[PDB]
Design a binder for these strands. Structure first.
Ligand code: ZN
Ligand code: ZN
Lengths: 107, 149, 764, 400, 248, 127, 99, 50
DNA sequence: TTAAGTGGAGCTGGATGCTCTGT
DNA sequence: TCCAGCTCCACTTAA
RNA sequence: ACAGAG
C-alpha cells in the first residue's frame, strides 16, 4: 500500500535498520519503526461455481433432522452455502430438489 | 446474454407463427404464392414479411446496438431491453413502418449494401493470388498432374 | 383518455425553411466570413514593419468586400450579373478595398480605398446582386428564382465547396491501440498551433508522447516539471481509490529510480530529450507552456490548470483498463462540420500573411539601398497574390496551406445540372474524413446518432457508400459564439475554482467537473440544479440558444459546448405531459401575428444537439408522451432528406430500394430552370413534355419540385407480356412514343477562343 | 416553508479586510496541525503575495534517522564553512515552505466567524497554498556541480528570465510568528467582529430583483451601429424600445392582412393611450366589414415590380382598392369575371384575394372571420365620416 | 464462391459460444498458411464420455487457472524481524473444482520464470498457506519489489496448459446417445493430445501450422481439405472435392 | 462517510455545541449594491466597497432550504466541496516599513457557496 | 424486392385522376388504402384496381385480372446511342503501340 | 446479367485457328454445366418457370 | 570468468477490384 | 490499414 | 484529380 511522509510527502520505502524494519523516506531523515504486525489484504475474485455443482456433485452439507423442502415436504433435496465472490461476502443459501416426476430449482 | 437468447426466441416465434397464418389464408392464384411455389422469384419469408410481420432487424447477428448512452435512440428509456426498443418491427410492409422501425430496418439494410461494396476488394485480390499459384498445373498424357518445371 | 393532438404542428417546418436549412447553411457561413472574420484576420495582422530602417510603418484600419464588378479593356467598369459570368467564362468577384495609414516622411499619410484583390462572391449571399430581388427582376438578370445559390462561379464553371466532416478538436479520446493497450489523446488545435499528445501504458507505466520529444517520457517527471513535486499531490489528483493507486504505483517507482525529485532536475531531464529545431531548462519550460497540451492556458508560467487536465487524462486511462469503455469516433456529437466560410477564412489568412511578407521584403530591399525619396508601398501593392490565390484554390480544389500543414484535395466539385434535384441535392452533401482509404465497414454503417440530422437512405451505392451523406430537411449548423456570458453565468451558478482545492475532490462521488470546449472551468456539487438553471437561462434568451449543455454521469463531467459546426435540430418543449405549442399559437402563426423566432423566445421550441438529446426523452407523437418526456418531435417525415422526399410511401418499401431512387432521381431528365434556354452548358438534357407527379410528398411542395418536374405519368399494366421483359426489361407502346412519351432533347456545347499573342499577331 | 428555525443575523466587519489571509496545506491532513511545531521565521512580499515559512524539526524523537540526517546536511553544506549555511547544526534542522498563489482576485471570498445566533463576515486579501519545498536538493546539486566541474521587436514579458527579475525587485518583509496558542491569537480574533446595533436597516443593497438580474447579466450591445426602421419582419410580440408603438402596428398589419378590433387591446394592453392613437391607425388601416384591412400604401409604392412568376405586371393600387371598395358596398365580390372589368391578370386578383379569404364554389371567396361589432369603442362620429371618406375613395375610382 | 459469401453471422459451432471466423476471412486464413490465426479451436474427444463428472476433471487439467483465482486472499505482512507476502489457498474451492493442486504444488508453480525467486524463499507452513519472502532484484529495481509481486503473483499459472484461454463442454442432441465432447479455444495441440483422459487419437485442430508441427505434412494436407470444405458448406456453396484436393 | 447539508451544519453549531467556528464562504461576483460615493458605470459591487454594519439576514426554512436575504433579493446557500486538508486563517500586518506581525486566528473546516436564485429572479419578469 | 409502395402509388394515383385530386404519399403518413378503395368503386372501377382485360393478339379475354394505373416514370440520362462503340483498327498510343 | 442498363463486351477473333478454339472449347452448348460442381447454369429463368 | 548459441523485441518494406463514360 | 524478414540485445550453458 | 454506371 502507498504510505507517504508527513514531512515532505514523497513516497516511503520499507528498509531495515539496526533494531527494526522501517518505513523510510528517500529525501528526508524521516523513518517509522515497524513495532507491531501490520497487514494489507487483497481479496481477489474466485472462479464461478454455478456450473460446478450442477449434475450430481459431491455435496455434503446435509445433516440429521434437516428440514424438508417447502414444495414436496420431503427431505429428498440437497442444500449448501457458498461464497460466490471473495470470503468477505456473507454466504448465500441455495437448494435443489430432485424427486420422481418432479424437477425444480429454488432459492 | 441469456436474456437476449430468450427474447430472440420469443420474437422468432411471432414471425414464424404469423407467417404460417398468412399462407393458410392466401388463396391459390395469389401471384406471390405462385412465384414462391414454383421458385421463380421470392420465398415464403418474403410473402410473410410483406403481409404478416417484418422480422427482428439484426445488425452483425445481434439486436440493435446502443448508439446513444445506454439506449438505441432517445425515444426509448435507458437500459430498456423491450422488443421495439431494440429493432423488432411489428409492422409489415403493407401496414407501413413507423419512424423508429424504419430507421432500424434501414440500419440492417445498409450492412448488405456495404458488404457488396466491400466484396469486390475483399475477393478479387484473393483470386489473383490463387491463379498465379495454380495456373501452371496441367493434366498430362501419362495421367499425372505436373508443374511447368 | 387519449392525449389530444395539435394537427397544425407541421406548419413550424415552412416557417423554419424561410430562415434556416435548405442551402441557407452555405449562405450563413459565407456571410459570417465576409462581414466579421475578414476583419479579425486584418486585426491580427494590422501592422507591418521593415526590420531594416525602423520608425516607418504601414497600418491597416479597416477592410471592405464591396459589390461585383468587371474590369474591361479601356478601364471602364460596370456591375455584372451571375449569368454574364457563365457565358463569357469569367469569375464573379467583388474588389477587396482596404484603407491604410502609412509614412512618406510625414508620419501619417492615409488612403481610404486601396484595392488589394478580388473576392469570389457566392450566389445569394449579402453582396450578390440577386439577393432581395423579386421574380420579375430575376428575369432581367437571366436567373431562376428556384436556383439555390450557395455556389461560386470561377472562370465560368459553377463550383460548390462541399461540407467537410471533421473530428472535434480539444477533446480527450480514450481508445485502444493496435496492440490492445488502452491510451488517450487530445488533438489540441488552437489558432496558433495544432498538435497531438498521447498517454501510453506501454509497460504498465504511464508515458507522455509528443513529436517534439525524441523519446516518450514518464508522466511523473512531467508532473514534477510542472511544479507539483510531492508524490502525494500527484496521487491525490490521479485518484485515491485503492485500485487506482495500485495501477499508478509502478509509475512512482520509475521516477524514484532516477534522481528526479525537483522541478529543476525534471526540466533538465526533458531538455536532454527535446529534438532541436539557453538549452536544457528553457527549451523544456517553454515547451510545456506552449506546445504540449497547448489548448490549456498557462498565464504566467503557472502550471496548476494544466496539471488538473493531465490528471483527468491519466484517470480515464486507468478506469478504461478495468472495463473497456473505449470511445467510438462514430458518435456524431464528436463530429464537427466545416462549411464554405470556415475554409475560406484559412485560405485568406495564408494569402494575407504572404502578402504582408512579400511587401515587407520589398521594403527591406529598397529602403537601405535605393534612394533618399521615402518610397510609398502603394506602388508595390500588386493585386495578383490575392486574386489568383482565391481563384486557383476554388477552381482546382486543392487547399495546400503550409502554415497549418493542411493538404486537402477534392474540396470543390462542379455543380451538377442533370436535373433540379441534382443541383439541390449536391448543396446538402457531407464528404467524410477517411475518403475511401480502405474498406473499414465501421463509419460506413448507419449510426443511430444520425437521427434527424443526416438522411438514412440518401447515400451512394458503390465505393463511396456511407462516406458521402446528405443533410435532413430540418437541420442547422451552428456558428462560433462570443463565449463571454457563458463564463460569467457559470461562475454564479456555484462553480468553484479548481485552483482553490487539492487533487482529492476529483475522486469524490458528489463532485462533477464542468468543461467548456475542453477547458476546465471548475467543479460543482448538485449538477442537476446547474443543468436545469442553464437551460432556463437559455430559454429566456440570456444565453444564446445554440449553446448546448449535457451531463456524463459515467465519467462525472458536465459539458458546455459553444463551438461552431455541430448539428442542431428543433423540438417542441414538453412540460408535465403537455406540449407547450397549443392550437392557439399555430393559428397565430398562419395569420402572421408571430414567426418562428417567437417560438424560441416564449420557450415553446428549443434547439437540441446530439450531445444533449442523449439526456432528453423525445416523444415521436403526442400519444406516446409518458411521465418522463422532455421534448416532442415536430415532423417525423423530416428524418428523410431532399432526394428521398420524392419517393411516395417509402415506409412501405424495402430499404435498399429507397437508396437506389436517391441515385436514379438525380439522373432523371427534366427541367433545369426558367433560364434553361438562355443557358449554354457543356451538356444539358431536357424532357419535352414534363408532367408533375400524380402522387406527391409534402417535401415535393416545400422544394417546389412540381414547378419544374422531371417525369411523365405512364399508364402501367402490371403483367407478363411477350417474354422480352424477363429481367427488369419493360415493354413500351409504339403509339405512345409517336405521340411524345419520353421525347427528349440533348444539348451540347462547342466553344472556340481566338487570342491575341504577345507578338502583334492574332487568330482569325 | 416558513423560517421555523434560526433566523440568523449577518454582520460585516472591515477592520481586518486588508490583513486577512487564508493559508492552506494541500498535503497535510486536517488532524495533523502545526500548532505544536516551533516556527523560526516568516517572510512575505506584500504585493505579488508570496509567503515563505521555515519550521524546525526535532532530532531527539525516534522518527529522525540521524545517520541519514548527517549525510543530507553534508551534501547541502560544505563540511565546516558555516558563514552562509541552510542548517546551523550538523543535521537537517529545518523544513522550508514555499507558497503558490491560487487566484488573482479574492473579492468574492469571505471568512465567517460564527457565534450563536449571528454570523460575522470579513473580506479576504489573499488565498495561498503552502507546499513543502525541495530547494535544498537543488542547492545540494549546485554545491556538487561546482566541486566537480535598431534591433527587431522583442517580447521580454512572455519570458521566465525577465518575469523572475521583476519579482526580485520587491524587498523581503520579515514577520514574527504568533501561533494559535499565544494570547495575541485570542486577542486579534475579536477584530473579526464588528461593533453595531442588533437591528439596522441597510442603506445599501436596496436594488430590486430585476435590477440585480440585469447587473449580473449585462446586455450584449450598448448601442447597435445600424438602426432598424423595421421593413424586415422583426418580432411583433417584442415591444422594441427604439421602435415607436405605431410602427409596430404597421409591421403587424403588413403581416396580418385582416384582424379584429378587440385584439388591439389584447396585444397592447390597457396602458396604451387607447383613444388618441386612432389618428395614427387611420393612416395605416381602415375598418371594413367589421374588421381592419391593411391600407394600400403599406404593401406597394408605385414603382414595385411583379411579386410573382408568369407574365410581369405593373403595380396599380386602385386595382386593389376597387376590390376592397366592392367588399364595402356589396356583401362580397360575387361574380365570375371581374378580371375582365378591371383588365389585369387573374394571377393578380386570385393571389391578392388569397391573403384575406377562402374559396367557396362559384361565389368567389368567403370572408375568413365573423362580423364583430363596430360599436365596441365609444366613438359616435366616425360612423358617418367614414362614409364621407370612402365616398372620396370611390370618387377617385370614378376617374378611371 | 468468395463473392457469394455475404459474411453471414449466426455461426457459433452449435454451442452458442466459441465464435469463429467464417466466409472470406476463413478462406484467406487457410490459403495464407499463417502460423497464427484468430479464433483457434481444438476439438478434444473424451474417452470416458459417459457423464459430466469425468468431463470437468480433464477440463480442469487443460483450462488455465491462476493462483489468484483459487486464493481467498493474498496479504503483505510486515513484522519487525522480517517481511513477506502470504497466500492462503481456498481449499474448499479446490475440492469443488476437482483440481489436483495444494500448497506443496503451488511451490512448484512459483520458482519458474518469476524474477529468479529461490526455492528456499518459498515455504509451505500448512496445507493452505504459502509465503514468498522477497529478495532484491539487483537489476533496475528497488527491494520494495513487493509492489511488483502483489500484482504479479496472482497471475501465475498453477494448473493446466498456459496457451488455453478457455474450454467448454458440448452436448449432442441425437436420441440414440448422449456424450460430451470438449472444445478447446487455444493453440497447443500437443499438450491437449497428452493429458490423461483425452482420446488423443481423435482430437483435431483448425490450425494447419499446429497440425503440421504435431502430426506431419499428411495430416496438415487433410486439414486444408476439411477446413475449406467446412467453410464452403456453411455458406451453402458446394465444390467438388477434387478442387480443394488439388489446392492442398 | 455521508454528506452533511447546510441546515445540519448550522444546527450542530447552535444547539449541540456553543463553540465558535470559522466558516469560509463564496459570494456571487456582484452583490446587489451601489459603490457608495466611490467615483463609479454600474460596475461590480463587492464586500470591499460596502461599510460595516448589518448586511443582511440568514434564513433557515423547513425542509432544509437555506436562504441569504441580502437586500430585497434572497440568495441561495449550499455546501461547497468538502475539503479535508488543513486550512489556517492568518492575519498579516505590516505594522512597520520592514517588519510586522503574523498571527494564526484558527482553522477552517467548512465551505459555503452562495448563489443567486435565477429561477426566482426570472419568474418575476420573464423574457 | 417488396416495393409495396409502387403497388400503392398505382392505386392512389388511379383514384386521384378519376376525381381531380393529388393524393399524398408522405412518409409515415399519406393517403390510406381504405380511402382510395372507396374512390375507385364510386367511379365504377374495382376497388383493388384490377380490370377485365382482353388480349389484343387473339381477341379472347385474359383469365387473370390485370392491375391498371398511372405510375410516375422518369427517363434516365443513360441512352444506348451515347454508348454504342466499335473499333476495327485505329489510332494507337505513342509509348506502347497498342490502342 | 440483369438488363438494367448493363453493358457487355464483344470480341471478333481475327484468325481461323482462333475461331475453332472459340467454337469448340468456348461454345455455349459445350458449357451448359459449370466446372465447379457439375451443375447446369444455362437453364430456364423467371417467366419460363412460371 | 567468458565464448557462444538462441530466446524475445523493435525496425523496415511490402501489399490492398474490375472496367467504360465524362469534365 | 495489416504482416513477414532482418538486426540488436539480454540470458542461460559450458569450458 | 474528381463524379458517375454496371
Ligand atoms: Zn519524507
Ligand atoms: Zn422433488
Amino acid at each position: 500500500m502507498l504510505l507517504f511522509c508527513p514531512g515532505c510527502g514523497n513516497g516511503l520505502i520499507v528498509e531495515e535498520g539496526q533494531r527494526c524494519h522501517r518505513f523510510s523516506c528517500n529525501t528526508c531523515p524521516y523513518v517509522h519503526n515497524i513495532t507491531r504486525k501490520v497487514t494489507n489484504r487483497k481479496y481477489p475474485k474466485l472462479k464461478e461455481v454455478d456450473d460446478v455443482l450442477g449434475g450430481a456433485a459431491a455435496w455434503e452439507n446435509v445433516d440429521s433432522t434437516a428440514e424438508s423442502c417447502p414444495k414436496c415436504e420431503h427431505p429428498r433435496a440437497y442444500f449448501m452455502q457458498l461464497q460466490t465472490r471473495s470470503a468477505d461476502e456473507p454466504m448465500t443459501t441455495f437448494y435443489k430438489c430432485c424427486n420422481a416426476q418432479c424437477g425444480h430449482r429454488w432459492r | 446474454e441469456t436474456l437476449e437468447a430468450l427474447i430472440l426466441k420469443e420474437l422468432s416465434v411471432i414471425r414464424d407463427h404469423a407467417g404460417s397464418a398468412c399462407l393458410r389464408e392466401l388463396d391459390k392464384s395469389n401471384s406471390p404464392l405462385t412465384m414462391a411455389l414454383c421458385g421463380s422469384k421470392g420465398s415464403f419469408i418474403n410473402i410473410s414479411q410483406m403481409i404478416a410481420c417484418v422480422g427482428q432487424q439484426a445488425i452483425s447477428g445481434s439486436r440493435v446496438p446502443d448508439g446513444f448512452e445506454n439506449r438505441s435512440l432517445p425515444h426509448f428509456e435507458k437500459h430498456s431491453k423491450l422488443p421495439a426498443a431494440k429493432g423488432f418491427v411489428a409492422n409489415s410492409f403493407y401496414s407501413g413502418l413507423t419512424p423508429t422501425e424504419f430507421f432500424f430496418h434501414t440500419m440492417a439494410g445498409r450492412e448488405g449494401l456495404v458488404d457488396t461494396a466491400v466484396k469486390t476488394a475483399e475477393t478479387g485480390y484473393m483470386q489473383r493470388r490463387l491463379v498465379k499459384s495454380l495456373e501452371d498445373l496441367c493434366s498430362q498424357y501419362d495421367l499425372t498432374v505436373r508443374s511447368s518445371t | 383518455a387519449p392525449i389530444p393532438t395539435v394537427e397544425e404542428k407541421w406548419r413550424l417546418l415552412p416557417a423554419f425553411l424561410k430562415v434556416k436549412g435548405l442551402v441557407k447553411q452555405h449562405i450563413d457561413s459565407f456571410n459570417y466570413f465576409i462581414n466579421v472574420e475578414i476583419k479579425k484576420i486584418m486585426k491580427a495582422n494590422e501592422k507591418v514593419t521593415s526590420d531594416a530602417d525602423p520608425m516607418w510603418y504601414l497600418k491597416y484600419l479597416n477592410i471592405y468586400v464591396g459589390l461585383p464588378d468587371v474590369e474591361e479593356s479601356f478601364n471602364v467598369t460596370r456591375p455584372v450579373s451571375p449569368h454574364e459570368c457563365r457565358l463569357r467564362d469569367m469569375t464573379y468577384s467583388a474588389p477587396i478595398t482596404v484603407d491604410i495609414e502609412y509614412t512618406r516622411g510625414s508620419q501619417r499619410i492615409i488612403r481610404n480605398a486601396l484595392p488589394i484583390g478580388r473576392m469570389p462572391i457566392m450566389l445569394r449571399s449579402s453582396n450578390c446582386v440577386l439577393t432581395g430581388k423579386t421574380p420579375a427582376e430575376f428575369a432581367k438578370l437571366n436567373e431562376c428564382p428556384l436556383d439555390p445559390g450557395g455556389y461560386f462561379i470561377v472562370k465560368g464553371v459553377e463550383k460548390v465547396i462541399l461540407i467537410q466532416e471533421q473530428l472535434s478538436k480539444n477533446r480527450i479520446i480514450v481508445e485502444a491501440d493496435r496492440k490492445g493497450a488502452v491510451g488517450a489523446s487530445v488533438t489540441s488545435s488552437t489558432h496558433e498551433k495544432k498538435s497531438r499528445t498521447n498517454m501510453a501504458v506501454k509497460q504498465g507505466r504511464f508515458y507522455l508522447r509528443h513529436n517534439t520529444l525524441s523519446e516518450d517520457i514518464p508522466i511523473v517527471i512531467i508532473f514534477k516539471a510542472m511544479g507539483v513535486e510531492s508524490d502525494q499531490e500527484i496521487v491525490q489528483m490521479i485518484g485515491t481509490e485503492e485500485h487506482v493507486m495500485a495501477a499508478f504505483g509502478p509509475s512512482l517507482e520509475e521516477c524514484q529510480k532516477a534522481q528526479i525529485f525537483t522541478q529543476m532536475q525534471a526540466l533538465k531531464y526533458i531538455g536532454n530529450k527535446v529534438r532541436r529545431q539557453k538549452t536544457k531548462i528553457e527549451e523544456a519550460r517553454e515547451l510545456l507552456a506552449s506546445t504540449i497540451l497547448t489548448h490549456v492556458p498557462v498565464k504566467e508560467f503557472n502550471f496548476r490548470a494544466k496539471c488538473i487536465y493531465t490528471a483527468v487524462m491519466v484517470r480515464r486511462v486507468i478506469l478504461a483498463q478495468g472495463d473497456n469503455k473505449v470511445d467510438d469516433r462514430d458518435y456524431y456529437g464528436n463530429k464537427r462540420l466545416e462549411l464554405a466560410g470556415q475554409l475560406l477564412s484559412l485560405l485568406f489568412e495564408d494569402l494575407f500573411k504572404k502578402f504582408n511578407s512579400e511587401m515587407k521584403k520589398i521594403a527591406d530591399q529598397v529602403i537601405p539601398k535605393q534612394r533618399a525619396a521615402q518610397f510609398d508601398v502603394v506602388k508595390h501593392m500588386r493585386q495578383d497574390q490575392i486574386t489568383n490565390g482565391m481563384v486557383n484554390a476554388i477552381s482546382t480544389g486543392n487547399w495546400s496551406l503550409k502554415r497549418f500543414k493542411m493538404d486537402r484535395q477534392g474540396v470543390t466539385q462542379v455543380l451538377s445540372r442533370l436535373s433540379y434535384i441534382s443541383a439541390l441535392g449536391m448543396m446538402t452533401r457531407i464528404s467524410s474524413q477517411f475518403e475511401k482509404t480502405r474498406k473499414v465497414s465501421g463509419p460506413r454503417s448507419l449510426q443511430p446518432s444520425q437521427w434527424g440530422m443526416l438522411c438514412p437512405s440518401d447515400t451512394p451505392e458503390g465505393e463511396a457508400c456511407g462516406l458521402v451523406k446528405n443533410l435532413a430537411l430540418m437541420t442547422h449548423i451552428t456558428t462560433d459564439m462570443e463565449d463571454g456570458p457563458i463564463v460569467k453565468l457559470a461562475s454564479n451558478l456555484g462553480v468553484e475554482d479548481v485552483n482553490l482545492l487539492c487533487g482529492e475532490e476529483l475522486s469524490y462521488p458528489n463532485v462533477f467537473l464542468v468543461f467548456l470546449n475542453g477547458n476546465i472551468l471548475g467543479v460543482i456539487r448538485d449538477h442537476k440544479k446547474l443543468v436545469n438553471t442553464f437551460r432556463l437561462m437559455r430559454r429566456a434568451g440570456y444565453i444564446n440558444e445554440f449553446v448546448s449543455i449535457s451531463t456524463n454521469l459515467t465519467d462525472r463531467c458536465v459539458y458546455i459546448s459553444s463551438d461552431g459546426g455541430r448539428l442542431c435540430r428543433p423540438y417542441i418543449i414538453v412540460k408535465k405531459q403537455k406540449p407547450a405549442v397549443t392550437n392557439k399559437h399555430m393559428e397565430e402563426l398562419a395569420q402572421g401575428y408571430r414567426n418562428f423566432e417567437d417560438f424560441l423566445h416564449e420557450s415553446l421550441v428549443e434547439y437540441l444537439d446530439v450531445n444533449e438529446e442523449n439526456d432528453c426523452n423525445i416523444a415521436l407523437y403526442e400519444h406516446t408522451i409518458n411521465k418522463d418526456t422532455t421534448h416532442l418531435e415536430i415532423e417525423p417525415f423530416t428524418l428523410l432528406g431532399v432526394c428521398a422526399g420524392l419517393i411516395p410511401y417509402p415506409h412501405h418499401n424495402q430499404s435498399p430500394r429507397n437508396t437506389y431512387q436517391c441515385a436514379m432521381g438525380k439522373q432523371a431528365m427534366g427541367t433545369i430552370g426558367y433560364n434553361q434556354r438562355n443557358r449554354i452548358d457543356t451538356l444539358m438534357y431536357l424532357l419535352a413534355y414534363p408532367q408533375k407527379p400524380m402522387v406527391k410528398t409534402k417535401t415535393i411542395e416545400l422544394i417546389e419540385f412540381e414547378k419544374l418536374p422531371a417525369g411523365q405519368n405512364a399508364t402501367v399494366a402490371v403483367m407478363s407480356y411477350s417474354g422480352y421483359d424477363i429481367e427488369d426489361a419493360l415493354v413500351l407502346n409504339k403509339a405512345s412514343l409517336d405521340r411524345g412519351f419520353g421525347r427528349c432533347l440533348v444539348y451540347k456545347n462547342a466553344k472556340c477562343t481566338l487570342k491575341r499573342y504577345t507578338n502583334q499577331t492574332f487568330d482569325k | 416553508d416558513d423560517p421555523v428555525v434560526q433566523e440568523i443575523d449577518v454582520y460585516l466587519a472591515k477592520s481586518l479586510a486588508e490583513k486577512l489571509y487564508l493559508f492552506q496545506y494541500p498535503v497535510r491532513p486536517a488532524s495533523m496541525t502545526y500548532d505544536d511545531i516551533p516556527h523560526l521565521s516568516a517572510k512575505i512580499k506584500p504585493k505579488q503575495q508570496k509567503v515563505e515559512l521555515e519550521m524546525a524539526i526535532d532530532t531527539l524523537n525516534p522518527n529522525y534517522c540521524r545517520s541519514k540526517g548527517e549525510q543530507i546536511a553534508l551534501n547541502v553544506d560544505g563540511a565546516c564553512a558555516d558563514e552562509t549555511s541552510t542548517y546551523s547544526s550538523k543535521l537537517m534542522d529545518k523544513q522550508t515552505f514555499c507558497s503558490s498563489q491560487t487566484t488573482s482576485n479574492t473579492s468574492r471570498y469571505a471568512a465567517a466567524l460564527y457565534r450563536q445566533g449571528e454570523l460575522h463576515l470579513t473580506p479576504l486579501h489573499g488565498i495561498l497554498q503552502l507546499r513543502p519545498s525541495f530547494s535544498y536538493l537543488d542547492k545540494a546539486d549546485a554545491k556538487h556541480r561546482e566541486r566537480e566541474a535598431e534591433q527587431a521587436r522583442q517580447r521580454r514579458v512572455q519570458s521566465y528570465e525577465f518575469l523572475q527579475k521583476k519579482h526580485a525587485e520587491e524587498p523581503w518583509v520579515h514577520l514574527h510568528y504568533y501561533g494559535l496558542r499565544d494570547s495575541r491569537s485570542e486577542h486579534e480574533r475579536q477584530y473579526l467582529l464588528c461593533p453595531g446595533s442588533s437591528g439596522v436597516e441597510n442603506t445599501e443593497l436596496v436594488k430590486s430583483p430585476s435590477e440585480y438580474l440585469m447587473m449580473l447579466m449585462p446586455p450584449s450591445q450598448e448601442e447597435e451601429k445600424d438602426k432598424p426602421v423595421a421593413p424586415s419582419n422583426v418580432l411583433s410580440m417584442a415591444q422594441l424600445r427604439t421602435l415607436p408603438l405605431a410602427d409596430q402596428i404597421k409591421i403587424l398589419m403588413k403581416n396580418v392582412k385582416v384582424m379584429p378590433f378587440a385584439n388591439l387591446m389584447s396585444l397592447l394592453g390597457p396602458s396604451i393611450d387607447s383613444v388618441a392613437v386612432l389618428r395614427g391607425i387611420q393612416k395605416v388601416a381602415m375598418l371594413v366589414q367589421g374588421n381592419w384591412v391593411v391600407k394600400s400604401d403599406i404593401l406597394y409604392p408605385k414603382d414595385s415590380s411583379s411579386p410573382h412568376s408568369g407574365v410581369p405586371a405593373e403595380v396599380l393600387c386602385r386595382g386593389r382598392d376597387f376590390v376592397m371598395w366592392k367588399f364595402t358596398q356589396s356583401r362580397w365580390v360575387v361574380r365570375k369575371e371581374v378580371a375582365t372589368v378591371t383588365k389585369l391578370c387573374a394571377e393578380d386578383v386570385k393571389d391578392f384575394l388569397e391573403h384575406m379569404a377562402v374559396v367557396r364554389i362559384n361565389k368567389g371567396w368567403e370572408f375568413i372571420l365573423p362580423y364583430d361589432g363596430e360599436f365596441i369603442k365609444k366613438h359616435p362620429d366616425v360612423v358617418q365620416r367614414q362614409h364621407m371618406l370612402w365616398t372620396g375613395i370611390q370618387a377617385k375610382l370614378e376617374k378611371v | 464462391p468468395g463473392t457469394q459469401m455475404t459474411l453471414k453471422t449466426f455461426h457459433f459451432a452449435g454451442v452458442a459460444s466459441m465464435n469463429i471466423t467464417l466466409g472470406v476471412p476463413r478462406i484467406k486464413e487457410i490459403i495464407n498458411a499463417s502460423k497464427a490465426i484468430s479464433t483457434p479451436i481444438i476439438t478434444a474427444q473424451l474417452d470416458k464420455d459417459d457423464d459430466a463428472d469425468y468431463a470437468r476433471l480433464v477440463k480442469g487439467r487443460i483450462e488455465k487457472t491462476l493462483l489468484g483465482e483459487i486464493s481467498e486472499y493474498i496479504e503483505e505482512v510486515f513484522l519487525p524481524d522480517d517481511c513477506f507476502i502470504l497466500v492462503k489457498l481456498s481449499l474448499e474451492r479446490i475440492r469443488l473444482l476437482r483440481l489436483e493442486v495444494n500448497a506443496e504444488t503451488v511451490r512448484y508453480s512459483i520458482c519458474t520464470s518469476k524474477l529468479r525467486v529461490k526455492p528456499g524463499d518459498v515455504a509451505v507452513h500448512g496445507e493452505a498457506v504459502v509465503c514468498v519472502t522477497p529478495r532484491e532484484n539487483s537489476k533496475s529495481s528497488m527491494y520494495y519489489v513487493l509492489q511488483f509481486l502483489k500484482e504479479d503473483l496472482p497471475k501465475v499459472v498453477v494448473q493446466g496448459i498456459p496457451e488455453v484461454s478457455r474450454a467448454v463442454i458440448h452436448i449432442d442432441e441425437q436420441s440414440g446417445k448422449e456424450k460430451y465432447k470438449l472444445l478447446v479455444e487455444g493453440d497447443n495441440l500437443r499438450a491437449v493430445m497428452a493429458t490423461h483422459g483425452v482420446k488423443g487419437t481423435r482430437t483435431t485442430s483448425n490450425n494447419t501450422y499446429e497440425v503440421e508441427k504435431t502430426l506431419g505434412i499428411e495430416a496438415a494436407r487433410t486439414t486444408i481439405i476439411n477446413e475449406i470444405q467446412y467453410t464452403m458448406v456453411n455458406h451453402g456453396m458446394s465444390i467438388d472435392r477434387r478442387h480443394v484436393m488439388l489446392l492442398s | 462517510l455521508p454528506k452533511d447539508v447546510s441546515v445540519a451544519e448550522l444546527l450542530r453549531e447552535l444547539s449541540l455545541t456553543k463553540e465558535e467556528e470559522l466558516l469560509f464562504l463564496q459570494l456571487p461576483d456582484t452583490l446587489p449594491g451601489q459603490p457608495p460615493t466611490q467615483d463609479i458605470a454600474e460596475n461590480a459591487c463587492t464586500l470591499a466597497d460596502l461599510t460595516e454594519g448589518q448586511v443582511g439576514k440568514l434564513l433557515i426554512r423547513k425542509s432544509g432550504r437555506v436562504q441569504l436575504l441580502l437586500g430585497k433579493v434572497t440568495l441561495d446557500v449550499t455546501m461547497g466541496t468538502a475539503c479535508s486538508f488543513l486550512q489556517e486563517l492568518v492575519s498579516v500586518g505590516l505594522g512597520d516599513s520592514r517588519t510586522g506581525e503574523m498571527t494564526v486566528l484558527g482553522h477552517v473546516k467548512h465551505k459555503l457557496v452562495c448563489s443567486p436564485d435565477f429561477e426566482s429572479l426570472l419568474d418575476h419578469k420573464h423574457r | 424486392r417488396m416495393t409495396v409502395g409502387k403497388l400503392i402509388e398505382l392505386l392512389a394515383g388511379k383514384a386521384g385522376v378519376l376525381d381531380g385530386r393529388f393524393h399524398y404519399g408522405t412518409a409515415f403518413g399519406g393517403s390510406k388504402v381504405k380511402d382510395v378503395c372507396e374512390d375507385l368503386v364510386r367511379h365504377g372501377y374495382n376497388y383493388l384496381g384490377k380490370d377485365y382485360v382482353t388480349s389484343g393478339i387473339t381477341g379472347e379475354p385474359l383469365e387473370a385480372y390485370i392491375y391498371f394505373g398511372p405510375v410516375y416514370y422518369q427517363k434516365l440520362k443513360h441512352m444506348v446511342l451515347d454508348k454504342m462503340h466499335a473499333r476495327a483498327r485505329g489510332p494507337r498510343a505513342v509509348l506502347t503501340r497498342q490502342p | 446479367a440483369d438488363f438494367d442498363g448493363d453493358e457487355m463486351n464483344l470480341h471478333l477473333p481475327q484468325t481461323e485457328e482462333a475461331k475453332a478454339e472459340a467454337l469448340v472449347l468456348m461454345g455455349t452448348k459445350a458449357n451448359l454445366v459449370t466446372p465447379r460442381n457439375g451443375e447446369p447454369l444455362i437453364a430456364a429463368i423467371q417467366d419460363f418457370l412460371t
